[PDB]
């Protein structure tokens, strides 16, 4: 499969958007990541593109170009390849060590801080959207449902993202307004829990029951593996069901588990 100067190779990532394939650029003899989307709506795609064009940070993916032809049903986004792929698969029987989780979590902090400063709410933070680059550091990927806001926070009403990572205030069935930055914090808390336990803190195959656990089930840590008390404190604060008292990113940065 040829696409101007790009030769499409095998699939390296996959999601609701479609697929991401390895692509070989014959102009510069270099590999890129090629996200392939089918027009089946389309305007959410160009919001993702508009957001990506504004982002330039070591812990965020880098959009290189967009190949859009009105005659073809497919649309192509070329990214710089983040060669080592997702930091982990969830669930897994081999979670990260605490020192490894801290290393990656420090990257996630920096990336989220940059995004929020650039007035973007990511809305789909999870380990499979955290890609490990050449130097071993994380880049945040997949802005497919991200929001841009004006002012100091987003005031939102729509429910998007990955269900196990959705914050409880986004799960009202009355279109209540909730603020955006704390949604990303919640998902960072689910992500950090996944780092060290290998599974999500709230789980159910029945979507109704999953929503109910996110909203109403108290967080429980497994007996094994035995994690540090300050890490438990940090996760507990990020998974505060009340967004008004949930820890904020400026405080996460200072948390004693993060800084030791
Ligand atoms: N989903 C994305 C995106 C995006 O949707 O924003 C951007 C990317 O650069 C990448 C990916 C990947 O899934 C991926 C999977 C395996 C190796 C590299 C990559 C990658 O580099
Ligand atoms: Cl995941």
Residues 221, 227: contact at Cβ < 8 Å? yes
Q: Is 8 exposed, middle or buried (0-12, 13-18, 19+ CB in 10 A)?
A: middle
Phi, psi of 42 (to 5 degrees): -90, -20
Q: 206 is written with which tokens? A: 């029945």
Q: Which residues have C-beta within 8 Å of that of residue 217, sequence separation ≥ 6? A: 202
Q: What is the CA radius of gyration of the chain?
A: 19
d(CA 161, CA 125): 8
- For residue 61, the ligand 1 atom closest to its alpha carbon is 9
Q: Which residues have C-beta within 8 Å of that of residue 174, sequence separation ≥ 6? A: none
Pocket of ligand 1 (CB under 6 A): 12-13, 20, 33, 35, 61, 79, 81-82, 85, 131, 141-142
Beta bridge partners of 33: 22, 79
Residue 106 CB neighbour total at 10 angstroms: 16
Q: 242 is written with which tokens? A: 């009340």
Closest CA to 95 of 217, 230, 256, 222: 222
Phi, psi of 5 (to 5 degrees): -85, 0
Residue 104 CB neighbour total at 10 angstroms: 21
Q: 210 is written with which tokens? A: 């999953």
Closest CA to 123 of 47, 195, 176: 47
**HSE-up of residue 242 (Cα within 13 Å, Cβ side):** 2
d(CA 60, CA 230): 28
Phi, psi of 36 (to 5 degrees): -110, 115
Q: Which of 141, 144, 145, 161 to mutate to test the pocket of ligand 1 (most atoms within 8 A of CB)?
A: 141
Q: Cα dihedral sign for 108, 14, 207, 197?
A: negative
Experimental method used, please?
A: X-ray
Give SS3 for 165.
helix
Active site residue 124: yes
d(CA 29, CA 31): 7
Cα angle 250, 100, 182; round to 5: 30
Closest CA to 184 of 257, 254, 260, 129: 129
Give SS3 for 233.
helix
Breaks (C-N over 2.5 A) in the chain follow: 40
Q: Domains, the chain, ranges and CATH? A: 1-81 (3.30.200.20), 82-260 (1.10.510.10)
Helix, strand, coil distribution of the chain in percent, nearest 5:
35, 20, 45
Q: Cα dihedral sign for 124, 75, 14, 196?
A: negative
Resolution of the determined structure in angstroms stands at: 1.9
DSSP line for 31-96: EEEEEEEE----HHHHHHHHHHHT---TTB--EEEEEE-TTSSEEEEEEE--TT-BS--SS-SS--
Quickly list H helices, 96-225.
98-117, 181-197, 207-216
- For residue 141, the ligand 1 atom closest to its alpha carbon is 6
């Amino acid at each position: 499969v040829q696409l101007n100067q790009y030769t499409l190779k095998d699939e390296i990532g996959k999601g609701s958007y479609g697929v991401v394939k390895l692509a070989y650029n014959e102009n510069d003899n270099t590999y890129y990541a090629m996200k392939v989307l089918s027009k089946k709506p389309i305007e959410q795609v160009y919001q993702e593109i508009a957001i990506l064009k504004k982002l330039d940070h070591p812990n965020v993916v880098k959009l290189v170009e967009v190949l859009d032809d009105p005659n073809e049903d497919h649309l192509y986004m070329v990214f710089e390849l983040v060669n080592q792929g997702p930091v982990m698969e969830v669930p897994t029987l081999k979670p990260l060590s605490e020192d490894q989780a801290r290393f990656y979590f420090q990257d996630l902090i920096k990336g989220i801080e940059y995004l929020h400063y650039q007035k973007i709410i990511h809305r789909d933070i999870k380990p499979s959207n955290l890609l490990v680059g050449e130097d071993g550091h994380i880049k945040i990927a997949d802005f497919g449902v991200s929001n841009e806001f004006k002012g100091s926070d987003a005031l939102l009403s729509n429910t998007v993202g990955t269900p196990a990572f959705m914050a409880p205030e986004s799960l009202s069935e009355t279109r209540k307004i909730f603020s955006g930055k704390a949604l990303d914090v919640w998902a960072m808390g689910v992500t950090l829990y996944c780092f060290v336990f290998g599974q999500c803190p709230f789980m159910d195959e029945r979507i109704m029951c999953l929503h109910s656990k996110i909203k109403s089930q108290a967080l429980e840590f497994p007996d094994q593996p035995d994690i540090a008390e300050d890490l438990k404190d940090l996760i507990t604060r990020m998974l505060d069901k009340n967004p008004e008292s949930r820890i904020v990113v400026p405080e996460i940065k200072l948390h004693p588990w993060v800084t030791r």
